[PDB]
Amino acid sequence: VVKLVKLTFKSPVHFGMKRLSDSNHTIAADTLFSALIIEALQQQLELSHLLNNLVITDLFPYNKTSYFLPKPLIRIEGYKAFKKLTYIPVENYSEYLRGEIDSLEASKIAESLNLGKASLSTKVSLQAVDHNGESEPYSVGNFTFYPESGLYFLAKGNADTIGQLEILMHALQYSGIGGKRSAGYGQFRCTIEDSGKFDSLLSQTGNIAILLSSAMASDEELVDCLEDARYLLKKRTGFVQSKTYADQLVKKKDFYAFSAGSTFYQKFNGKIFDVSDNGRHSVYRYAKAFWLEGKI
Amino acid sequence: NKKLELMYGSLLHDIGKIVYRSTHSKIGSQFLNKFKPFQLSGIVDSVSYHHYKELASSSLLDDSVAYITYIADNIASGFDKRAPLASIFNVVNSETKGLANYTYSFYRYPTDAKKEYTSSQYAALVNKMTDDLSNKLKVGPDSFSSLLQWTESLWSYIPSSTDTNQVMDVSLYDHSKITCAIASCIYDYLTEMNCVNYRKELFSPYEKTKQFYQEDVFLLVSLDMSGIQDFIYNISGSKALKSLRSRSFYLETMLESLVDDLLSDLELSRANLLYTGGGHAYLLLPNTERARDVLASFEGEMKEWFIKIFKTDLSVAIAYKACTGEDLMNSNGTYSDLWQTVSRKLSDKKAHKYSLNEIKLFNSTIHAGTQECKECLRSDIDISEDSLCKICEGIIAISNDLRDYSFFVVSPEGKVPLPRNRYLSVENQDGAERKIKMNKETRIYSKNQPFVGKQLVTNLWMCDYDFSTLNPETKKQGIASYVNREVGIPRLGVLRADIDNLGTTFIKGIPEQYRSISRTATLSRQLSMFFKFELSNILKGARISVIYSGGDDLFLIGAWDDVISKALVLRKAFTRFSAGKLTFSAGIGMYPVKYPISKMASETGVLEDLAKRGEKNQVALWNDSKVFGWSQLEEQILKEKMIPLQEALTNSQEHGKSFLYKMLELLRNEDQINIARLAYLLARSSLSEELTQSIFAWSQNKQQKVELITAIEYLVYQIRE
Amino acid sequence: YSKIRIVGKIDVLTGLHIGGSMIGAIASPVVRDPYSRLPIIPGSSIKGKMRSLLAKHIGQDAPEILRLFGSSQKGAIQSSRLQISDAFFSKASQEEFDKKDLAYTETKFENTISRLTAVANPRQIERVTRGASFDFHIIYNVENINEVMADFENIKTAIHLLENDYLGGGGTRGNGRIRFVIDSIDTVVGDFDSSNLSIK
Ligand SMILES: Nc1ncnc2c1ncn2[C@@H]1O[C@H](COP(=O)(O)OP(=O)(O)NP(=O)(O)O)[C@@H](O)[C@H]1O
């Protein structure tokens, strides 16, 4: 049961990269899945459905006109325009896979992305000032989406899993996503419905398979999948966000996952990876693979 | 051994040209026989018989390196003695900009005038060569790098061919270096093929010489570092500026070490390194099975090293394509296609950057890593009490030394990690000598030292201009001494510049008829020397610290007025050196002295990106609204508007900054009525009539009101207390 | 788990200058939405001001302050009950300012008479114009039902102080007087009842 979930962000969102100052347009599937797991823990919903039957996709830009998908990593025959290009609309995706898109069209597509404006809010901490100290400046990156634009993701799962996802997303609307939530960022409203265009696009058979989420194969299937594969091993890491994990904030075990848009000739079913060591509970890093087939 | 003699002969095969212009082979043999060390049979025979006619009559042993030198000269090449060296930019972008006539006079700029090198200048070069060869230079396996450096320092602006019919873009040094590289590759290929008799398959049948041209014996090998720009700016502010000055240089020196390691594994000199740009290194290697095995082992070792040290932050991908002599000679139009294939293989290597075992080891972390460094943000490596990683601490410690000293040392013990279980450090001459003595096979890179004479030293161009370091007090102040202004607003200007369509210039700037390894290598050398040495020459008296200057990217922080003025001067000198053709677009930002370095760099990068947008060759000064052309900013603003306003304000005894601010408010109000109020203010101002009319006309029209606003802002910034 | 939505307006009783350039221009421009350019109140500023005022009232290391506004101390990790989103320039106030053709932000000229030379140093500070209303959205999290009444009493005290104490800016010199109007208090998530709960 594929469900497209669109998110319109009332407030600017951090979605920070490794730096707090750094701001990203979107977040990977692991971040959204961690948010869902946190919400399920708060809402006291069972995690079996999310861990087993739920397959989500990296949040992707969408404008007033089209929905954007990550640029597939395929051989192309003005390479700089393609390299700077990051997201391709749904209709142009098949054309890009076939290779009909040229450098001028690639630049036009990259300019067509009207997701939002990235800014760097400058803030201070006055906690030290009371204690005979000095204010500490810091910077929080943010990405203010244009009113029609937002972030969408496809979630595939069982009907019960889809309903639990609906409840979790309804709660996450007010919980928020990304960084510096509960400090004025990350608030959004989500609308989840069946998407005809994505249901048709996913129901395709092609010689190549494109990752729609930050995923990583298990050690048994990596040998099969990695052959003839064009990918981008993105470093996913960070600190654990929970109250019961440890007395203090502890970094997650460093993880490396194939980025969205990576093309594999042989598909692999991703695995929920545990990146928690010496903690009271387990930290789930979502690396389940959402695949889109295509012909090149 | 024999290869050493062949390299010495090939690098000196056309040394006879200089003495003849003061034939190319008959006199060069005598000149080299004058010196005892170079009187070796392999060298003098290579010099004397590198021409086909002399080789026909040569009484050799059918296995002398002279045939290899002759065929290498033929591949590299494929009669006024006073003819000058034509600049590479004469043919670069000749289809669009045109075919200029700029030539180099006897770092130097092409002057476009008609100049002929006098025989007296060639004689002076001849006695310089005699003094260097007789006493300073010597023949040895470790001394050939000194020979190459000496050739680079002398023959860099000597025409390869006196023939005025063909273009004289390729210098004597470039031609000799390419000939030496080709000779080394061909010697290795023949040794692999067990070619005991060179004459049989090289010279004696002309058809077999043509076949050897068609035979695939060379390897165009490109190694590119990925993650460079991320690595440089993967920093926190705490010492960002230092790291900003260091990391780039680090990713420079490390890269050089890389190629040297490769050239150490193939037993080839720096001549085979065709050209190194920003993170890219293109080399010409033999097609031997040993060469390919060395390339594979080197790729595996360097991937392992980068995974061990920087994990996925940095990587190096090296891809090779086999080619024939025809491909290097651009026959059949496959040279550009050859480089296209090399870069396509490089991109395919980039896509599949890691293997199965490496990915599994990436994901098979044992512990969380608890504390992490501030800059690298990595917990796998041990982190000191200062929350700095060992590599990060090494980079920070390097920064100052690399800014001060001049001898980089790849020693077993040093500051920052380098590939083959060594560390880069920066010391003076005495420190470099001590490092050489204590540990043998230790590489020394001399910064901005064309001087030859040190056998175990390779020259390494690097722009390290820092006005604060001129005085110890200003060095202690740092960038804060730049805002130490008794007059003018204390601010730091940040300039970030990038060449526009430089990649296309290397790809398709040179026409098909002029495409060659020699010409592209010459262009790369000139660009690198401009952005390393000539960039330092341009910024001489300015209060500017060059944080880094790559192949095309340049980032420097200094006094705002000095930064703007030197950006204009740099644009003018770039136009002079590139003879039109290449242009660059820059972003200039004004910030307070205590403004964070990361914020200044980010905002200036945004300004430069906006300047690149649309029409290139533009500078984005201060706010984004003020994107102007280089000629527009230099003349239409400062000369046309700012200077007359300064003259009027300094001459008028009844005017001051208040009048300027009133003008600025009227110009920025933009209510369509403030034109009349500005006219009224000018009428009551008792200013110059011509200046009053000029100001009114500039205000009445767009694209000139903004320039007048920019001029007024510049003036009021300049005349601050 | 319950989530209580608190939607209301912040009325600028005196020009609000949150802040956070060109010569002879506003050297301290207020924070604005990067796209719409409308001045906004960062949720960080509201949260910090409320936390500081409630800390002064309680006296931060107090358990109420840590639970309400989040804590990351060793052994004390507490999710912030109060998620105070950025207050945005309300559409009604935007229309009111478009009528009469009034700028959303005023440039207030101030100076600095020194004690030594008696000379004046001028500044042009941007302030959100008086009479502007910001739509503020806050989410309260019910981690413990028993603590909800005490937490809402603390929020009421903080809101009263923030109605008496300026919001971000040089409020001791007048810049930042605000008034809170609580339009609605609803429980978006959960079965909790917020009818009795009142911020003011
Ligand atoms: N040491 C350096 N300092 C400054 N600029 C550099 C340096 N090395 C390379 N550059 C510039 O950085 C740009 C490319 O750098 P780099 O990040 O390596 O991109 P890349 O080669 O395409 N690798 P990647 O971006 O990961 O695909 C070019 O404009 C270079 O001139």
Ligand SMILES: [Mg+2]
């Ligand atoms: Mg560039």
